[PDB]
Subunit: 444 residues, 4 copies
């Protein structure tokens, strides 16, 4: 049973030899969305859709292990926006892709199923290794990157994010991490940091690695110490990791939040310059087809007062349409606007005179390649960047967890215990954990 | 005193040397194409396209300005009409006298530009007459072209790429003493060597337009093109497009030329392009509605591109029409590709679908004129005969008003040239063998 | 079922991919080999006098087991590279040491740990069978291969594949090379054959062309601009003969260095005009074994400036190493690049750091190409912008002599080898395009 | 007329406007540290280490130079000793006068610098006295420090990064009127604002060295450091290394400091460095003798690094010792990593194994001083209190000889400072609250 696996992981006296020899259960507990139910939301608006009515907790058969892959006993995961989007079947259900992609080969076909096991983060222990897997073995304490790339095309051989056959694990693949067991490629695997618990270790993955590419990597903004970095939604999932990269890299974050409580979160992170966009009442759109340059100017005036007359070197974009005109306007001459999302709307509108005449640059970014994910996770291992857990749910209550994220109820990360019976487990370096406890817990 | 005629005489006589030009005294006045502070409101309540530059353009006799440190007075043999010269001609968006006036507060030397008249023009080919204090790289008698960037670099901002200087000025636009005249005043760090195999007007043709395309497409500050790239070029036979297309070809890349007519298409074929789209014949309506873009039209355009490339997307979009085409440019670029912009002629409020940008790791790079190193390299490529001037039409100085009109109303393809001091076309070639090597290419736009 | 039986099926249109894959693997295939028994054989001798004709065997060998990610290719043609010659003379040590030790990693790695070594690091041929999880390639596909074998289990190579710590060079650090009737490669080595070229022409560029691409054209190398003055050592050599074409196709200005008038003429045939015959000029950059001559640096720099009209070099395309590196550094422009992929004259470089830091220059190390770089390099061949540079072709049984030829640096450009191909000039699929580029294709012949 | 005391006092009084300070009569002479054209052969036949700067340095009374366009005259409160100041003391490799003579031929203003004496010094902190024509960024009364780069930028070479300008000069070394003096002449594009929380001597300390480290390590023209990098810093408690180490730490990177004593190691620990190698305690001998290197020592060194990093290699090597160390530097750096070099203090004939460079895709990047944007950014980091000055010792102006001697002999860690007009240490701080925050960091080297 799975309980044998849980007890074997927990016990201090267990070997790599031991963990290999335990038999796989016939099925495991999984968070699921169903294919027969994809029409369930019938003429409802998006915000009017409830993940609690579409999410199931099923017993599901263990998948066949292929070459290059790994079966992992999952202690914890988190809720990501992609997970929520899949719950609602928005813009469409995830079964479309799983079906079309399943046609390519028999290995691809494993994913084409009446249910979809979701989740794109994980922290656990490797149970089985596939053939051709050498860097990892059973018993290894791991977290997982969510990029699944095949690399048959040559397009990704100078940055795997350009691979045309890429898949986001647990979104465009089945067997995601919101379950007691998961199937991932071994080149998704990263070592779990010693000083964190399972759910803390699971919390950064997708979001932190995305922030890393966007802001720190040379494929993104390429931040340098001293830069003024404008960070929209600074207390949210993405923003919370971005703010930390800015601070830890010796740059100056200009945190934009929507409340005094969110502002206090950024001050705790260490940010000095904070704009509450709700208190200042910036209306970058007059009506939703006309923008207000006056408001862009007013906002840039506020930034200049906080920086002592400096503009923004790098804007960390993600709200999109509502905000994107201001972002382009406020950036310094020669500076960079970096974007990984458009949550308020994907039809961006900006004045190009401010872009071309001031030699600025808009850089698109999406997730992270494995080297980038490694590096970001490594910075978590070193205690430079910290997990941003605000609330932990049990696997039982992922439905509620997904609703909570859907209505933006919590700051930072929302995490899910999977196999872990209680919070706070899986800490190996008690000394280092104590050195950073205050920071690890800032969101809680 | 010494007239401009005496200077011509001495330029054109066979064995006149650098010694003889240096010895000539400065003339006291010169003929210059001008706009008057008097007349900035003469274009009333009229649409832009109904403003006639010929009403505002004067040919004046103007005094020679004081030659300052780090500067050169040049006898201008030829020049060209640029869009910026046309915008100054009508008074759009505002007249140029506002900036001359404000910048004129900054120093005694800056105040020289603050005049009741504005000598316009941002290109030149001619002969250095006299050199101000501290100028060493140039001397009287040198045959030169000019770049249009003037920088002070008092600020630290432009010390890693000079286009970042906040005190920059476009010569002939945000400075006075421009090149549509018999004499010009420039910084010595605007001067580049005149190509020997070209006549004066041909050497003055590429200037501003060629150096802009270079930075945008070739330079690492822009797109940083590579041989084998597919480069989508909007307006490919127009002034800017005509240089962009040549850079893509000379650099081993594959231009995908967009044009608006079959005669324009033939111009691209003459330059050596094979992948050509007549966007009017195909009837692209990227905007169904003044407020609404049509993604089916983006998709149809991308399909046409892929037929021409054999299934490949655009590595680099060379943008400049702006609002109308910008959504389409973002859509059709390859995953990890670049959209480079230096203008928005159809409208500066760009709208695009950011999903295509972030999800496929695309980049929009803003570009503007060229720093002087980029301008030197661009001009050097003309001197090498890798890239050719694209003159379609040449006017005399007296007829610059007509030239400005011709450009305002988009009458010609390529460049519109102006003879200044030069009494006729085709003068000033020193390397006739290299010229015969490239003559067909040099005359492609005639 | 023989290779002749394999060959006849290939050249038939009805032969389905599932049917070319239905063909049972022959007992054996013919293969160019080095024997572990024999690594000793040249002890005592100067490198110069070691004769690959004495160590190269043509053996009948079995087909290796096919794994995940891999393909078996019926090899119509290959080429001789310096790495194949090195192995054939067992220098600096033999290839067997690595084959053994790396064999320890997995059951699949052990397949290579054999008493013989099938050599060769280029190919052109037809896919015979694909292993588990290969989707982009299938039996019957007409392919060339790049020689980079990467595992990609480490994160190191996921922002540029040349950074993978577990890399091997196919046919040198792997067994089952391309100088043979059948080869085993990863499917991520496969690229489509240029239609307008014959098998041996299509095999010719791989290793060296892709190397030149990365070093000179790629942003991971020098990232050449049109207009750049590019100094190319050994410009009619195998590597130099592709670097020169990239400079020209890319609208740059190669300054070609050659060591003979015949080599100069070949550079003029490619389209180069600025040529320095370093031999006729008698450059002696080293006064003796331990002392450099900066006067000779300067003299060489003056000659460069005579050719460019007073301009220094934007990018030096280095590979001779010790003999030339001091001069390469000296003649580079302020802010310029020296790019290096080899050190044929000796790997201990000595240079004056004053010329490098005070003029803000860069030395950039490059090695082979990642798959995208290689795919792009091969695409430029396919478009007819870059041409193969065969000077000489040998049959499979004469690979010993071919190897000897390259060892002795006898020919210019590339030396090719017909493997399964029964004669020269077969395998062109676009005859009009070939007639367009024929004179260019045959320059080195 | 007025003496220097009278300006010093006039500066200090609060009813002095900029216009007042500017209206102040210049003195007939000012005190300046100098070297004499008379005496360039003084050290003939002596080994470098036996050459004594106290023997060649004079304290002279010197006339104020003519003020030119784009320039400022500065009352210098403090300066510092740099290696280049020391090299000019001992006239190695050749005296400075040669360059000063040759460049004097350029213009009348260039000729100002061509004198029988050379006022030395490439750092300063002080007060703007007088501003030349065209200067708008700065005015009399302004509290300033100086970057040591003077560029003309008449050539195009330097318009995408001014360190490529062929007419560059290092101020105080290739120019006269250096900063070891009571008055200095600089270009206004050398001036940066002085950090409020720092004393004059503290503000003068970073200048040349800090901006060098910045270009080399932080800038995209150098290694382009990121957070998480392993950075090997040779001579970590030295001038250059004292800033390099702070950049690595303040940018979230991991310095591996190489020092030559447990005392030097203690200072690295006070900076915040965790990984420290004492090359003396370990006894690395990278060379067996003068013509043969020892790779066994490279590997041994490599192993020690790997112990401190936990199995990781070096992303970025911060080089400057050169010959002794370069082989090891190239060996220890990670696949795809960078060696960045700005000097070769043990010898400029570098020998390294190219196999490690090409097979592992490594880069050697050369770097030299800083462009003005870089220097501005370096000094801004000091001002924001992210980076601190590393003064260990301070001399008065009359003891500059002794100061150059000490530096020549490598007696001190960090920076050696020099008071010029300041009558005592610790003057000139305006923000005592920021100072209090950073005091222990500021005095770490004392
Ligand atoms: Cl799959
Ligand atoms: Cl002016
Ligand atoms: Cl293998
Ligand atoms: Cl001067």
């Amino acid at each position: 049973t799975v309980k044998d696996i849980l007890d074997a992981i927990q016990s201090p006296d267990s070997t790599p030899a031991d963990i290999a020899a335990l038999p796989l259960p016939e099925s495991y507990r999984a968070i699921t969305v169903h294919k027969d139910e994809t029409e369930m939301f019938a003429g409802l608006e998006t915000r009017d859709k409830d993940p609690r009515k579409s999410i199931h907790l099923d017993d599901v058969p263990v998948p066949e292990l292929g070459p290059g892959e790994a079966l992992v006993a999952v202690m914890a995961s988190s809720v990501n926006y992609n997970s929520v989007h899949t719950s609602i079947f928005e813009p469409l259900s995830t079964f479309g892709f799983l079906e079309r992609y399943g046609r390519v080969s028999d290995l691809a076909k494993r994913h084409d199923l009446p249910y979809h096991v979701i989740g794109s983060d994980l922290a656990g222990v490797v149970l089985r290794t596939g053939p051709g897997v050498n860097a990892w073995q059973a018993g290894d304490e791991v977290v997982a990157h969510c990029l699944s790339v095949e690399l048959e095309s040559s397009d990704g051989h100078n940055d795997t994010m350009l691979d045309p056959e890429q898949r986001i694990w647990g979104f465009e693949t089945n067997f995601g991490g919101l379950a007691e067991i998961a199937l991932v490629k071994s080149n998704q695997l990263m070592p779990k940091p010693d000083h964190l618990s399972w759910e803390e270790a699971a919390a950064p993955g997708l979001v932190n690695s995305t922030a890393y590419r966007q802001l720190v990597s040379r494929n993104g903004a390429g931040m340098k110490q001293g830069d003024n970095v404008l960070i929209w939604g600074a207390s949210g999932g993405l923003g919370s990791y971005a703010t930390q990269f800015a601070l830890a890299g010796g740059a100056n974050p200009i945190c934009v939040v929507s409340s005094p409580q969110k502002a206090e979160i950024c001050r705790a992170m260490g940010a000095e310059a904070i704009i509450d966009r709700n208190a200042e009442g910036y209306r970058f759109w007059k009506d939703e087809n006309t923008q207000d340059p006056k408001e862009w100017k007013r906002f840039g005036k506020r930034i200049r007062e906080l920086t002592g007359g400096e503009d923004i070197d790098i804007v960390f974009e993600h709200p999109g349409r509502e905000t994107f005109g201001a972002s382009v306007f406020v950036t310094r001459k020669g500076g960079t606007i970096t974007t990984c999302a458009s949550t308020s709307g994907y039809m961006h509108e900006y004045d190009n005179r401010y872009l071309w005449m001031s030699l600025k640059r808009i850089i698109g970014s999406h997730f992270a390649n494995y080297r980038e994910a490694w590096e970001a996770n490594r910075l978590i291992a070193k205690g430079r960047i910290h997990p941003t857990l605000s609330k932990v749910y049990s696997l039982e209550d992922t439905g509620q967890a997904a609703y909570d994220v859907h209505r933006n109820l919590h700051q930072g990360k929302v995490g899910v215990l999977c196999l872990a019976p209680e919070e706070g487990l899986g800490v190996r370096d008690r000394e280092k954990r104590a050195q950073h406890l205050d920071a690890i817990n800032r969101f809680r």
